[PDB]
Structure formats: C-alpha cells, structure tokens
C-alpha cells in the first residue's frame, strides 16, 4: 500500500500540462491516507483494487505506469483523458482484472496480445483511440468476457476466429474500424450474444450461414461494409432479432423468405445493395415491422399483397428498384404509416384507395413510375401531407377537384403528368408550402390571385402548361421566391412591374409566352438574380437601361422578340454576364465600344438584327459561329464572318 501509493505518485509526477485544481491533488500523505482520501483509489485489506481516474484531465503515457507495484488491480478505468503512447504488454499482468477501460484517449499502436492473459476479464473497453493492427487472437481466451468494445479505432485484419470461443460474450462492438477479410463462421458459436455491431468496416465475403445459430442476438448491425454473396436464409432463424441492418454492402441474390419468421423484427435495413428477384410474400408476416427500407436495390416483380398484414408499419422505403405491376392496397393500409417512398420504379395502374386512409401519411414519393388514373379520394383529403411527389407519371383529372387543403404541406411536385383544370385557390391554405412545381401538365385558366399571397413560397414552377391571362401587379407579394418559372404558357399582356419587388429572385423564366409591349423600365432591383429568360415573347421597343443594374446577372436571354434600337453601352455594368442571347429581334446600330470591358462573355448570339459596324473585343465574338453573328445589316469593319 505505501509502496503502491509511492509507485502511483512517481507515475503521477510524469503527467504533463497539469493544474493545481486537478482532482489528483488528494494524492498526498502516502503513508496514512492512500486508501481513505485519494481520489479514484479504493482498497481491500489495504491494497488498491480499483483505480478510477476517468475524466480527470490527465495528460501522460503508460510507459512509467507501476505495473509490478499494483498486483491486486481488479478495476481500471482511465477513460476520457489525454493519455498518449501505446498499451504496454504489462497490462496483461493484472491477473485479477475484471474491468479494463482505456477508452476516449489518444492511444496508438497495436493491442498487446498479452491481454489474453487476463483470465478474469469481463469487460474490455478501448474505444475512440487510434489503435491499429490486427485484433490479437489470444483475446478469444478470455472466456468470462461479457462485452468487448473496440469501436472507433484504426484496427485492420480479420476478426479472430478465436472470438467464437467467448461463450459468455453478450455485446461485440467493433464498428468504425478497417477490419477486413471474411466474417469468421465461428461467430455463430456465440450462443450468449445479444448485440453484434460490425458496421462501418471493410469486411468482405459472405455472411456466415452459421449466424442462424445466434438465437439471442437482438441487434445485428453490419451495414457499410463490402460483404458479397446473398443473404443466407439462416438469418431467418435469429429469432430474437429486432434490428437487422445490412445496408450499403455489395450483397446479391434474392431476399430470403425466411425473414418472415423474424416475429420481433421492427427495423430492417437492406438498402444500397444489389439484391435482385421478387420480394417474398412471407415478408408480410414480419408482424413487428416498423421501419422497412429495402430501397436502392434491383428488386423486380410486384410488391406482395401480404404487406397489408404489417399493421405496425410506419416507414416503407422501396424507392430506386425495378418493382412493377400495380400497387396493392395493403402497402398503405397501416394505420400508422407516415412515410411511403415508391419513386423510381416501374409501377403501373392506378393508386389504391388506401393511400392515406388513416389520415397520417406525411411523405409520399411516386416519381418516375408508369402510374395513371385519378388521385384517390383519401389522398385528396390527406391533411397530414408534408411532401408529395407525383413527377413523371400519367396521373389525370381535374387538378381543382383532385387536391384538397393541405395545411402541413411543405413540398409538392406534380410535374410531367396529364392533370387538367384550373389551379384552385385552395393551395393558399398550404401556408407552409415552400415549393410548388407543376411543370408539363394540361393546366388551363388563370393563376388565382391567392397564389401571390403565399409569401413563404420559395420556388414556383408552373412552366409548360396552357395557363392564360395577364399577371397582376400583386405578384410583388412573393417576397421569398427565388426560382420563378412561368415559361411555356400563354400568359399575355405586359410583364408586371411588381417583379421589381421579388428581391430574393435568383432564377426568373418568363419565356415562350405572349407577353407584349415594353420590358418594364423600372425592373432594376433584383440583386440576387443571375438568370433571366424573357425569350420567345411579343416584347418590343428598346432594351431598358434598368436591366443593366442587375449586376449578378450571369445569363440573359431576350431572344425571339421585337426589341428595337441600339444595344446600350451600359451593358458593361454586367461584369458577371457570361451568356447573352439577343437573336431574332430588330436591334440596330453598333455593338457599343465598351464590350471589351466585359470579360466573362463567352456565349453570345446577336444574329438576325439590324445592327451594323464592327464586332467588339472579347472572346465570344472571336469564338462565334456563322449562325451566332449572321443576318445583321453591316457586319464587321472588313465584312467578315470568319476572323477579323
Ligand atoms: C500503427 O501506428 C503506429 C503509430 O503511428 C502514429 O500514429 C498514427 C495514429 C498516425 O498518426 C501515424 O502517422 C503515426 O506515425 C505506426 O508506427 C509508427 O511508424 C512511424 C513511421 O512508419 C514512426 O515514425 C518514425 O519515427 C522515427 C523517430 O523515432 C523516424 O526516424 C522515422 O523517420 C519515422 O518518422 C513512428 O515512430 C511509429 N510509432 C510507433 C512505432 O509507435 C505503425 O507503423 C502502425 N502500424 C500499422 C499501420 O500497421
Ligand atoms: C430560354 O427559354 C427558351 C424556351 O422558352 C429556350 O429555348 C430553347 O433553346 C434550345 C437551344 O437554344 C432549343 O433546343 C434546340 O431545339 C431544336 C429543335 O429540336 C434543335 O434543332 C436545336 O439543335 C436545339 O436542340 C429549344 O428547342 C428551345 N426551346 C423552345 C421551347 O423553343 C432557351 O434556350 C432559354 N434560354 C437559355 C439561356 O436557357
Ligand atoms: C425594324 O425597325 C425599323 C426601325 O424603325 C424604328 O422606328 C421607331 C419606331 C424606333 O423604334 C426607332 O428605334 C427605329 O428607327 C423599322 O423601320 C421603320 O418602319 C416604319 C414603318 O412603321 C417607317 O415609318 C420608318 O421610316 C422606318 N425606319 C427606318 C429607319 O427604316 C422597321 O419597320 C422594323 N421592322 C419590323 C419588322 O418591325
Ligand atoms: C495484494 O497482493 C499481495 C501480493 O501480490 C497479496 O499478498 C499475498 O497474500 C497471500 C495470501 O493472503 C500470501 O500467502 C502471500 O504471502 C502474500 N504475498 C505478499 C508478497 O505479501 C495480498 O493478499 C493482495 N491483497 C488483495 C486484497 O488482493
Ligand atoms: C468510475 O467512476 C464513474 C463515475 O464516478 C462510474 O460511472 C458510472 O458507471 C455506472 C455503470 O458502471 C453508471 O450506471 C453510472 O451512471 C456512472 N456514473 C457516472 C457519474 O458516470 C464508473 O462506473 C466507475 N468505474 C469503476 C470501475 O469504478
Ligand atoms: C460495392 O458497391 C459500391 C456502391 O457504392 C461500389 O462503389 C462504387 O464503385 C463504382 C466504381 O467501381 C462507382 O459507382 C463509385 O465510384 C463507387 N461508389 C459509389 C457508387 O458510391 C463498389 O465498387 C462495389 N464493390 C464491388 C462491386 O466489389
Ligand atoms: C501542453 O499544452 C500545450 C498547449 O496545447 C502543447 O503545445 C504542449 O505540447 C502540451 N504538452 C507539453 C508537454 O507541453
Ligand atoms: C477455440 O477453443 C478450442 C478449445 O480446444 C481450440 O481447440 C480452438 O483452436 C479455439 N479456436 C481458435 C480459433 O483458437
Ligand atoms: C440463448 O438462447 C438459449 C435458447 O434456449 C437460451 O436457453 C439461453 O438462456 C440464451 N442465453 C442468453 C445469455 O440469453
């Protein structure tokens, strides 16, 4: 004891960057108080058996640790400190060691195989260090081990097959490492195992079929590895499983139907693999299933109708597969289903009547399927909707009757469908809606004025429709819109001056419309705008000087219009302007002597105008093709279509 206290004092004297306020100040009077007052020290029969210095700001190494002087250590917790260096082999000399924790330190080097001498060890914790090399196989000797935690290290090599000899192990945590090679099938001998976390490693090979003997494992995390082969059907024999995660691997073959035998399985993650074949209908017998994610695979065939038996199903992710056939009604029949991601598949037919039958669906994705028909009535009245994506289908019906009031709606995408009718003002009650995208539909009529009352709208895309009417000046109320796309419609009249007020506007496209008369002269107050496309309209008169004050403009397209007069010399204020399309207009005069000042100008078309004179000094005019510069009255000082 006095020798133990002296030995620990000499080790303490090697600590660096220490403070008088350290909790080790109590290490005084070794001859009297070692077993009564010393912080972290506890004794039996006046001999230290417990050294607990966790989170005491100790900075040092174990080189001068008094191994020989503390023979009776049974509990060592030196975690959450600033210990550096290696783990000396003499740590294996503490024959009575039961608990050993060096976690959350700055230790380096390999794990000494002498730890396999600690025959009484029940907990080994070495997490969150920089330990490298292979795990010693002699650790498999420690048959009293209840828990091994080596995660968040730099360990390499295979998991030792001796680990199968640890008949009392309950938890094996080896995640966040660089372990490699095949998983030893001897792990199937770990009959007491409850948690197997080998995720985030570089493990290869097949999942051992002996895993079917692990009847007590409730958590199997092996995701983010490089496992190959197919999921062995023996996995369906791990009856205690409630979480099975094999995602982000290179697994192939079919999903074994034996997974339906996992009556306690609540979480199944199989995504980001190369699984093929059909989804077994026996997967509908996973009665506890809450979170089923087998998205991002190559599964084919139809979704089984037995999915209606998954009464606890909350999240279903089937996106990015090759599933086909009609969507069976049981896929959305769960009363607690809140996420239903089916996009990027080959589903056909119409949506089932069960989609939002409980009024709890929040996330629905159906992008890029072959679906068609009407929106089901339970979807029209699904007030819990937060995101809904129908893009890339053949859905039909009156858009004013197919969609109700969605107060919790945040994002909706109806693009590339066959919706008809007029935009209803009901959308205005989606006070949380930040994006409304309905490109490429058969929407007709005017835009209801309530749409401009959506100050929270960030992105509004009604392009490639048959919308008509004149835009009112109340369009200025969209304070937070940054992407406005109304192009490809039959909107008529003047462009409203109120677009001035859309300060956050970055991307504005009013092209391919019937806008007439002059571009608003006041339109000069869009500091975030980098793209403006007013092409293919009926606009005329001079190009207004206000456009030259939108400094951040990168791309400007005023082509296919009836603008006249001269290109202003104030285009020099568009230093950021890269693309400038002015073709098919009635512009006149000289390209202003000032275009040299503009530098980022690479793609310019000024063809089919009445301009005359010489081309100015910058790339795009040198790099212009015949079509880019043709059709003007008097081109170039030396009448050139080729260089100078
Ligand atoms: C396991 O890791 C050790 C230690 O590596 C050290 O810590 C890591 C977390 C990384 O930050 C490494 O960059 C860092 O070095 C490896 O051993 C170490 O090898 C290096 C060079 O390979 C040794 O540096 C040498 O130091 C001498 C001076 O004594 C110089 O003359 C040399 O030119 C060279 O700079 C370093 O001393 C050594 N550290 C030890 C042995 O504790 C080890 O190779 C690695 N094992 C693996 C990856 O299998
Ligand atoms: C501004 O919006 C208009 C449309 O509103 C864009 O016009 C599009 O321009 C591209 C190329 O300039 C056209 O593609 C061309 O199609 C023809 C016919 O298929 C083909 O022969 C060409 O080789 C080229 O592929 C496209 O058809 C045209 N769209 C329409 C509806 O006319 C314009 O590009 C936009 N401006 C900017 C800067 O993006
Ligand atoms: C293309 O433009 C020319 C230029 O005329 C414009 O006239 C003003 C209205 C103003 O815009 C100026 O910047 C231009 O000079 C048109 O030519 C004129 O045509 C009118 C007939 O309406 C005639 O009275 C004028 O004398 C013409 N002027 C010149 C200089 O020739 C031309 O008609 C326009 N072409 C098209 C297809 O629109
Ligand atoms: C602490 O360690 C010492 C030695 O490692 C133990 O002392 C031995 O005790 C046994 C039986 O009690 C004796 O037969 C030996 O002669 C002792 N050896 C020495 C060098 O004293 C001591 O029992 C241990 N104490 C605890 C609480 O584990
Ligand atoms: C060392 O001391 C710490 C804190 O004084 C102990 O941490 C406790 O550990 C148990 C589990 O063994 C937890 O249930 C407690 O909540 C923890 N408390 C705190 C404050 O962290 C730790 O167990 C001790 N270790 C040894 C070997 O004595
Ligand atoms: C396992 O699957 C992953 C998929 O993430 C593969 O990683 C990709 O490999 C190719 C290049 O060979 C590219 O698609 C990407 O560069 C990789 N990363 C991705 C897609 O995130 C990996 O190659 C596969 N291993 C195999 C087949 O042995
Ligand atoms: C002590 O802390 C300083 C500041 O972080 C650091 O530069 C130094 O390496 C540490 N160790 C010693 C022995 O000074
Ligand atoms: C596991 O223990 C048995 C006991 O005899 C031994 O024969 C076997 O070699 C051990 N496995 C490994 C991989 O060391
Ligand atoms: C492992 O499962 C078997 C199955 O019979 C059971 O008897 C045993 O108690 C379980 N072990 C643990 C540690 O739960």
From TrEMBL:
Its EC number is 2.7.11.1. It is a single-pass type I membrane protein. GO terms for biological process: cell differentiation; plant organ morphogenesis. It is found in: Cell membrane. Disulfide bonds join 35-43, 356-382. It catalyses: L-threonyl-[protein] + ATP = O-phospho-L-threonyl-[protein] + ADP + H(+); L-seryl-[protein] + ATP = O-phospho-L-seryl-[protein] + ADP + H(+). Its main location: membrane. Keywords: ATP-binding, Cell membrane, Glycoprotein, Kinase, Leucine-rich repeat, Membrane, Nucleotide-binding, Phosphoprotein, Receptor, Repeat, Serine/threonine-protein kinase, Signal, Transferase, Transmembrane, Transmembrane helix. One of its GO terms (molecular function) is protein serine/threonine kinase activity. Glycans are attached at residues 17, 165, 216. Signal peptide: none annotated. GO terms for cellular component: plasma membrane. This is non-specific serine/threonine protein kinase.
